[PDB]
């Protein structure tokens, strides 16, 4: 039982986990991220961005587009099902979504959007 995951990004590109798993009873689900490196958000940024497995090569592409200024994501992206904003060291965000966004049988991943990031930065985040 729970509703929440707290998840971290470095200073060598990695998120802390590769796997979020969402119970089905969660209304809501809240993720906390946090950067415990000591890199700049100009040089080692990261968010938590969440959209379906198809979708996350387009949000990627055009949040690098959209600039360091946008947090590098695309303004009122409707592909984007959840996202924190862009942090660098010691800082922190938190944010929750409606897990009805969510329908089985779909693919979801999670990812940073930070230019070159998502390589290395992605995930699986499902509901079961
Ligand atoms: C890598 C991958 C890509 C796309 N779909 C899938 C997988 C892996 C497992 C899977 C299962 C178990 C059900 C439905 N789709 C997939
Ligand atoms: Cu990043």
């Known amino acids: 039982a729970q509703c929440s ?3 971290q990004g470095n200073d060598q590109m990695q998120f802390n986990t590769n796997a979020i798993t969402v119970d ?8 906390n991220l946090s950067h415990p490196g000591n890199l700049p958000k100009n040089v080692m940024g ?3 961005v969440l959209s379906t497995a198809a ?3 387009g949000v990627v592409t055009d949040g690098m587009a959209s600039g360091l ?7 009122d992206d409707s592909r984007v099902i959840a996202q924190t904003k862009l942090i660098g060291s010691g800082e ?18 999670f990812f940073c959007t930070f230019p070159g990031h998502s390589a290395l930065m992605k995930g ?5």
């Open 69 to 75: 200024d946008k947090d590098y994501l695309k303004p």
């Open 46 to 48: 990261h968010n938590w």
């Open 92 to 109: 922190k965000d938190s944010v929750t979504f409606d897990v009805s966004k969510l329908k089985e049988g779909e693919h979801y991943m």
């Open 55 to 57: 979708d996350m090569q």
């Open 5 to 7: 995951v707290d998840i």
């Open 124 to 128: 699986t985040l499902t509901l079961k």
């Open 24 to 31: 089905k009873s969660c209304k809501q689900f809240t993720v």
